[PDB]
Symmetry: C3
Subunit: 113 residues, 3 copies
């Protein structure tokens, strides 16, 4: 169970923190959306939330990552929601397949149900 | 016609403001993108804009929400752009199917056409 | 080779900077993801990064843009990653098909591999 602080960025000016799949997974379009496990857990730094997006090279190879929100106070495992677009996609254990981007969490007076 | 201030968040640290469909709608993949009505209208708080994203549990059930930008000065009805991925999807009136996330609107000198 | 400063926004309160395709391109669903060229190059203003999203009217006409991250220090050509959803899509040279949104780049202590 690793916290977000263990993630790395490709370059100093890279916006995304790369996420790996902890399992070897084969995906086909007929399977629809699948939740890939990353081994990384919330919560996030104060006053931030996360967006999970695909890496461009992975998108171009036919694996679509559906953008996901990581809440500031989420303490579960970060999953990547993904679907093979056209072809059979093979995700090997350790392949970096998505990235976490951190964004400011704006306060509002909206009610909390 | 309800303003964004009427939306609610799941938990204090939830980044998204949940959006419902005001109509019962059936969707199939052959239909392609459909615009679902929410009953909620812009504009947004000063110096912010909005992103519309799917809820993860709804994405995993096979309804893809295409991410959308809500401009600061949009005064129309917020719609959710959605497509059934693989299967028939039935959206009941009142189902929360997407979420609005508020983000800072950065000023630049880019021209305004 | 044009910098981001040359882009325009639809209205003063429009969050997105519109991106055009510099080539006439036909797309079908069987083709999967294709990278469209825009003629516009990073890098981005200090302390910002970019998200590339579809325009809503273009999404509703059946061209899906996969959201992409533009890093602060990217100096290559901004491309739009796109797929025809259901039908044949014809992108004419000069059609505005996506938009760049600028967001704050949050600093963290994550390591840089
Ligand atoms: O891609 C994702 C999206 C969400 N998540 C986790 C973290 C986020 O805080 C949590 C809930 O996200 P959403 O609000 O998008 N899902 P939903 O509205 O279905 O669940 P909840 O009712 O708990 O808010 O799911 C992921 O791990 N990966
Ligand atoms: O998912 C969405 C996306 C956009 N919208 C509305 C609000 C946003 O301010 C407005 C215009 O969004 P885009 O700029 O993405 N669309 P487009 O560029 O086609 O229209 P315009 O030329 O008016 O900017 O459409 C939604 O209601 N839901
Ligand atoms: O839609 C996109 C996404 C990315 N890009 C460019 C700019 C961005 O800085 C760069 C790298 O993006 P990602 O980190 O998403 N791709 P990946 O992780 O495959 O490459 P790298 O290993 O270089 O980080 O690709 C685009 O031009 N359009
Ligand atoms: Mg990268
Ligand atoms: Mg939620
Ligand atoms: Mg627009």
């Amino acid at each position: 169970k690793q916290p977000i602080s263990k993630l790395t960025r490709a370059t100093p000016g890279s916006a995304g923190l790369d996420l790996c799949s902890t399992s070897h997974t084969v995906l086909t379009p007929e399977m629809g959306p699948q939740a890939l496990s990353t081994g990384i857990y919330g919560p996030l730094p104060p006053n931030t939330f996360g967006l999970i997006l695909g890496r461009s090279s992975i998108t171009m190879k036919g694996l679509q990552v559906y953008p996901g929100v990581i809440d500031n106070d989420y303490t579960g495992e970060i999953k990547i929601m993904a679907k093979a677009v056209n072809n059979i996609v093979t995700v090997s254990q350790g392949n970096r397949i998505a990235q976490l981007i951190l964004l400011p969490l704006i306060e509002t007076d909206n009610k909390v149900q």
